Amino acid sequence: MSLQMVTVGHNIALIQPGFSLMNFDGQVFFFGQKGWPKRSCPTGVFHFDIKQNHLKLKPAIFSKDSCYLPPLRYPATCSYKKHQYIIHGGKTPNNELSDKIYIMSVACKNNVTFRCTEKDLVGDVPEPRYGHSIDVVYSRGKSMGVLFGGRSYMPSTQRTTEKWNSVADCLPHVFLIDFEFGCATSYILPELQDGLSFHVSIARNDTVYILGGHSLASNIRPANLYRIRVDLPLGTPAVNCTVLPGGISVSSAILTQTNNDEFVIVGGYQLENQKRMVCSLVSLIEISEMETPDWTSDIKHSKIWFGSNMGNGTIFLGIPGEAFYFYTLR
C-alpha cells in the first residue's frame, strides 16, 4: 500500500465530503459536487480521470430519457450486475434528505453518456436518510436489495425549528427492495437493537456483513459485526441476522476490492478525538490487521479526512488545508 499525492484542476472546489465515485468499465466517475450544478456541467456527474498524479474532472452528459438528479452527500450506493449503480438517500445542497432511488447506467459511449432513471417506491418506503448502507444479495437465482441504518431529521411531528437540523439514527430495520418493480419490505430483527450510521457493508451471495459504524444515541462506535442472511423463495423472503465476535470498531471507513472474495478497508474515525490509522483485511469472514502504510505528517495531524473507493483496489483520500489536499492509496 503506497501513498501518492494528487494535484487537481481548476474545479477542485467541486470535491466535498460525502461525495461518491463510481466505476464503469474501468472508467471512474464522480458525483456529489459542491453546490447546485452550473452551466459548465449541468448534470453534476464528471469523468474522474487521474493522469500522472494530476486529477481532471471532465463534465459527463446525461441521455434524453434521464432524470437530472441533484448532487447527494452521503448516499447509500451499490453496484448491480447491464452494469449499473443504485443511489438511495443522501443530503441535497438545500440540506434536504432524499428518499428517492436513482439508477445510473452507461447509455452511450463516444470516444460517455449516462442514463439516470428514478425508480418509484411503494409499500414500506424507507424514511429519507443519509449515511446508510445498501447492497444487492442473490438467493436462489433471484436478486434483492438490502438496505440498513443511517440518520434523518426528527419527524414532522416532533421537529422544532430551535433544533431543526437535529438528526437521529434510523430504526435498525432491514429493508428488502425489489428494483424492477419498486417494492419495499421492512423487517424488525431482535439482534439489531440500536441504530447505526456510517458503517461498512460487504455483500457476498445471500449474505451482507455489517461492520463498525456510529450509534448516535449511545455515542459509541460499537465493536460488533452482524451477518445478515437473505432467502428468496417463492413467497415472502426470510431474513436472519446473527451477531459475530471479532468485530472492528470504526465509523466512516472506506472499502475497496483487491481480489475476488477479499476486501481491504482503510481507516475512518475510531473516536471523536482519535483517528483510525491502521488498516484491516477481510477474507470471506476473517478480519486481520495489516501493516499501516506510510502516512505523511499532514495526514497524521489532520483531525478530518474523507474519501471514496475508486474501484481498482485504490482509495482516493482528502485532508483539510489551498482548499483540500488529496492522495491516492493503492
Partner 1 sequence: VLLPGYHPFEWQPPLKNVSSRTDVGIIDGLSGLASSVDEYPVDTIAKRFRYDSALVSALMDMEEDILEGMRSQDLDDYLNGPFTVVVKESCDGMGDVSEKEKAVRFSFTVMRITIEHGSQNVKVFEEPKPNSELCCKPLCLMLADESDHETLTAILSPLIAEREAMKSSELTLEMGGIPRTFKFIFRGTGYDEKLVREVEGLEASGSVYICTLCDTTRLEASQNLVFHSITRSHAENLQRYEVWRSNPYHESVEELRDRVKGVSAKPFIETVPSIDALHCDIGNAAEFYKIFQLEIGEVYKHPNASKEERKRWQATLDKHLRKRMNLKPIMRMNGNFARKLMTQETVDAVCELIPSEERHEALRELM
Shortest Å distance, C-beta 47 to partner 1: 16
Q: Which of 3, 125, 136, 216 binds partner 1 (CB under 8 A)?
A: 216
Rg (CA), the chain: 19
The Cα 166–Cα 151 span in angstroms is 10
> CB atoms < 10 A from the CB of 194, how many?
15
Longest CA pairwise span in the chain (Å): 57
Asked if 198 interacts with partner 1 (CB under 8 A), we say: yes
Instruction: Report residue 163 as a C-alpha cell.
Output: 433544533
Q: Which is nearer to partner 1, 170 or 230 (CB)?
A: 170
Asked if 3 interacts with partner 1 (CB under 8 A), we say: no
Region binding partner 1 by CB under 8 A among candidate stretches 13-21, 79-87, 132-140, 222-230: 13-21
| Residues after which the chain is discontinuous, using a C–N cutoff of 2.5 Å | 81, 111, 284, 321
Shortest Å distance, C-beta 216 to partner 1: 8
Long-range contacts: 180-189, Cβ < 8 Å, 24+? 182/101, 182/119, 182/120, 182/121, 182/122, 183/121, 183/122, 183/123, 184/121, 184/122, 184/123, 184/124, 184/125, 184/126, 185/123, 185/124, 185/236, 185/237, 186/124, 186/126, 187/239, 189/239, 189/241
Shortest Å distance, C-beta 213 to partner 1: 9
Asked if 151 interacts with partner 1 (CB under 8 A), we say: yes
Asked if 30 interacts with partner 1 (CB under 8 A), we say: no
Is residue 109 within 8 A of residue 126, CB to CB? The reply is no
Q: Which is nearer to partner 1, 113 or 186 (CB)?
A: 113
Q: Which is nearer to partner 1, 133 or 207 (CB)?
A: 133
Region binding partner 1 by CB under 8 A among candidate stretches 24-32, 57-65, 178-186, 290-298: 57-65
Asked if 212 interacts with partner 1 (CB under 8 A), we say: no
Report the amino acid identity of residue 206.
D
Residue 205, judged by CB atoms within 10 A of its CB (0-12, 13-18, 19+), counts as exposed
Task: Report the candidate in 114, 115, 119 with the shortest Cα–Cα distance to residue 134.
Answer: 119
Asked if 17 interacts with partner 1 (CB under 8 A), we say: yes
Shortest Å distance, C-beta 5 to partner 1: 21
Asked if 95 interacts with partner 1 (CB under 8 A), we say: yes
Size of site (CB under 8 A) for partner 1: 53
Q: Which helix (H) or strand (E) holds 79?
A: strand 76-80
Instruction: Report residue 15 as a C-alpha cell.
Output: 470535491
Asked if 152 interacts with partner 1 (CB under 8 A), we say: no
Is residue 265 within 8 A of residue 280, CB to CB? The reply is yes
Region binding partner 1 by CB under 8 A among candidate stretches 160-168, 202-210, 233-241, 290-298: 160-168
Asked if 251 interacts with partner 1 (CB under 8 A), we say: yes
Shortest Å distance, C-beta 54 to partner 1: 25
Separation in Å, CA 262 to CA 23, 162, 284: 18, 47, 7
Region binding partner 1 by CB under 8 A among candidate stretches 70-78, 229-237, 278-286, 308-316: 70-78
What count of Cα atoms within 13 Å lies in the side-chain half-sphere of residue 325?
13
Region binding partner 1 by CB under 8 A among candidate stretches 4-12, 14-22, 281-289, 292-300: 14-22
Region binding partner 1 by CB under 8 A among candidate stretches 11-19, 79-87, 176-184, 286-294: 11-19
The Cα 249–Cα 225 span in angstroms is 9
Asked if 10 interacts with partner 1 (CB under 8 A), we say: no
**Which residues form the interface with partner 1 (CB under 8 A)?**
16-18, 34-39, 42-43, 61-62, 64-70, 73-74, 91-96, 118, 131, 151, 156, 159-167, 197-198, 214, 216, 251-252, 268-269, 272, 303-304, 320
